[PDB]
Amino acid sequence: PKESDRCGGCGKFTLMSKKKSHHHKKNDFQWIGCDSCQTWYHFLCSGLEQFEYYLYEKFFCPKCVPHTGHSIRYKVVAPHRYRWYSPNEKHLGIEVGSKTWIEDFITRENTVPSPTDDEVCIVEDGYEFRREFEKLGGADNWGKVFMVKDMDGLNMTMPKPGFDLEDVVKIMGSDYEVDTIDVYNQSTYSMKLDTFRKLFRDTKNRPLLYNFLSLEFSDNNEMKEIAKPPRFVQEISMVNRLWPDVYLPEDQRPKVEQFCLAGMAGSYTDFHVDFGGSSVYYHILKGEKIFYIAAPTEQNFAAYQAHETSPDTTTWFGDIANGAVKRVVIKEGQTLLIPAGWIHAVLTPVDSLVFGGNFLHLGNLEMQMRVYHLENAIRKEIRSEEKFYFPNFELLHWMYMRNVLLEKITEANQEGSDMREQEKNIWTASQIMKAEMERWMDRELRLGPEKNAILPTDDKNKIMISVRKQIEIQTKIQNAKNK
Numbered sequence: 001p002k003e004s005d006r007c008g009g010c011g012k013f014t015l016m017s018k019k020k021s022h023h024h025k026k027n028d029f030q031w032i033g034c035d036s037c038q039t040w041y042h043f044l045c046s047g048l049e050q051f052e053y054y055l056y057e058k059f060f061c062p063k064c065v066p067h068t069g070h071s072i073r074y075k076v077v078a079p080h081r082y083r084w085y086s087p088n089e090k091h092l093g094i095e096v097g098s099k100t101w102i103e104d105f106i107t108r109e110n111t112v113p114s115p116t117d118d119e120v121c122i123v124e125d126g127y128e129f130r131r132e133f134e135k136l137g138g139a140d141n142w143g144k145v146f147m148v149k150d151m152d153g154l155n156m157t158m159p160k161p162g163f164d165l166e167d168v169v170k171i172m173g174s175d176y177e178v179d180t181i182d183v184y185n186q187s188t189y190s191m192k193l194d195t196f197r198k199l200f201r202d203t204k205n206r207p208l209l210y211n212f213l214s215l216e217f218s219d220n221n222e223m224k225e226i227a228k229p230p231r232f233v234q235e236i237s238m239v240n241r242l243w244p245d246v247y248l249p250e251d252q253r254p255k256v257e258q259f260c261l262a263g264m265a266g267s268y269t270d271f272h273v274d275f276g277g278s279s280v281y282y283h284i285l286k287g288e289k290i291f292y293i294a295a296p297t298e299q300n301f302a303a304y305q306a307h308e309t310s311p312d313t314t315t316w317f318g319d320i321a322n323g324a325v326k327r328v329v330i331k332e333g334q335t336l337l338i339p340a341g342w343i344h345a346v347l348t349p350v351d352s353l354v355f356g357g358n359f360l361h362l363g364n365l366e367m368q369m370r371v372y373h374l375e376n377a378i379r380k381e382i383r384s385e386e387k388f389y390f391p392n393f394e395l396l397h398w399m400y401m402r403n404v405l406l407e408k409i410t411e412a413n414q415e416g417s418d419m420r421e422q423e424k425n426i427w428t429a430s431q432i433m434k435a436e437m438e439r440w441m442d443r444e445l446r447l448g449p450e451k452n453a454i455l456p457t458d459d460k461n462k463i464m465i466s467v468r469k470q471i472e473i474q475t476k477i478q479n480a481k482n483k
C-alpha cells in the first residue's frame with residue numbers, strides 16, 4: 001500500500017525445459033516497505049529472492065538488518081493449508097501436501113499395497129533388467145515399471161557416490177537459478193542454487209521444505225558428461241534420434257532428458273502423469289523415494305482426470321482410486337524405469353539427490369498420444385496453466401514423421417519391399433502416428449494454428465501429402481503378395 005514515492009533500490013517512483021517460476025514474475029514489481037526505515041522497495045529490488053516475497057510479515061531492508069536483525073516471518077497459523085500464514089483459513093480442512101497432511105501421511109503411507117508382478121518388476125542389476133525387459137518383448141512392448149537394484153549392466157553413466165550438492169553448485173555455478181517447489185505452499189519459486197544449498201545443509205531449521213523441480217543440465221558441458229540416460233534409453237529416445245549429440249535448430253530441441261533433482265526429507269509431490277506421456281529413468285544417487293503408482297488403464301485415467309479438475313484439495317487420489325494405487329520404495333543406488341502413462345505421486349522420506357530424465361519413444365506411441373489427449377482435456381477444464389507440458393510435442397512428431405518414418409517407407413517403396421518382413425514396427429508406428437497427425441491437421445483447418453506452432457501449415461500439408469502417398473504405395477506393395 002504505497003504512494004507516488006520512490007523505490008530505495010532502483011530509485012524509481014510508482015520454454016524448452018521444465019520451468020514454472022516465470023509465471024508470477026508479476027510480483028517482482030509489487031512493493032514491500034521496510035518496517036524500520038520505512039523506505040519502499042520493488043520486491044525485485046528489495047534483495048529478497050522470489051521464494052521469500054511472501055514469507056515476511058515484518059520486512060527489514062538490507063540497510064536495517066545490521067541493527068534490526070532479520071525480517072520476521074508470518075506465524076504458521078494454519079499448518080494444514082497451503083496459505084499457512086492465513087488466520088481466515090485456520091478452520092478449513094487439511095489440504096494434501098500441507099505440513100499437517102504430510103506428517104499424517106507418513107504414519108499411514110506404508111499401509112499402501114505393494115504392486116503386482118504384472119505392474120512392477122524388481123531385478124538385482126542391469127544385466128537381469130535387460131533379460132527381463134527382453135522376455136517381455138523389449139522396448140516396443142514396454143509396459144511395466146522396473147526397479148533395478150544395482151546399475152551394473154545398465155550402461156548408465158552416473159557420478160560416483162559422494163558426489164553431492166556442493167559438486168552441483170560448483171559445476172552449475174553458485175548463482176544459477178533453479179525452480180524450486182515450496183512444498184508446504186505447493187507452489188514454485190526461483191531460488192539461487194547456492195541458497196538452496198544453504199537451506200539444504202541446515203538440517204536443524206526447516207520451517208518450509210524445498211525440493212527442486214528440474215535442473216536440466218544437458219547444455220552444461222561438464223554436467224552433461226557426468227550423468228546420462230541408460231544406453232537403451234538413448235537408443236529409443238525420439239528426441240535423441242532427431243537431435244543427435246552435437247539439422248533441426250538446437251533452440252527447438254525439447255530439453256528434458258537430463259535433470260537433477262534434490263529434495264528435503266518430508267517432501268511430497270502429488271499425483272501426475274509425466275508430460276507428453278513420456279517415460280522416465282530415475283537413479284537415486286543419495287537418499288530414498290517412495291513412489292505411489294497406478295497403471296494407465298482407461299478407467300484410472302478417467303478417475304485421475306476427475307481428481308484433477310475437481311476443485312477439491314483435501315482428498316488423496318489414492319483414497320478414491322478403487323485400490324489401483326501401489327507403493328514402491330526406491331533406495332539409494334537404485335534405479336527406476338517408468339514407461340508411458342503411469343500415474344504417480346512421490347514421497348521423499350529422506351534428504352535426497354537424484355538424476356533422471358524424460359523421453360518419448362515409438363514403442364509407447366499410442367500411450368503417449370492418449371496422455372496427450374488427457375492433458376488437452378484437463379487444460380480445457382481448468383485454467384491452471386502453471387502446468388508444464390512436453391515442449392514442442394507436435395513439432396517433434398512432424399520432424400520424426402518427415403526425417404525418420406517417411407524416409408524409411410519411401411526407401412522400402414523404391415526397392416519394392418514389403419515392410420512387414422523386416423520393418424513391421426516402423427510400419428505400424430507410422431500409421432498410428434499418421435492417423436493422430438491427420439486429427440491435428442483437421443483441427444488446424446477448423447480453428448487455425450496454435451499460438452505457438454513453429455512449423456508453417458504449408459510445410460505440414462506438404463509432409464502430410466508425401467506421407468499419404470508413400471503409405472498408399474506401400475499398402476499396394478503389400479496387397480500385391482495376394483492371389
Ligand SMILES: O=C(O)CC[C@@H](O)C(=O)O
Nearest residue numbers: 211268269274289344346
Ligand atoms: O521425486 C518427486 O518429487 C517427483 C518426481 C517425478 O514424478 C517428476 O515428474 O518430477
Ligand SMILES: [Fe+2]
Nearest residue numbers: 272273274344
Ligand atoms: Fe513424474
Ligand SMILES: [Zn+2]
Nearest residue numbers: 007010042045
Ligand atoms: Zn525498484
Ligand SMILES: [Zn+2]
Nearest residue numbers: 034037061064
Ligand atoms: Zn530499512
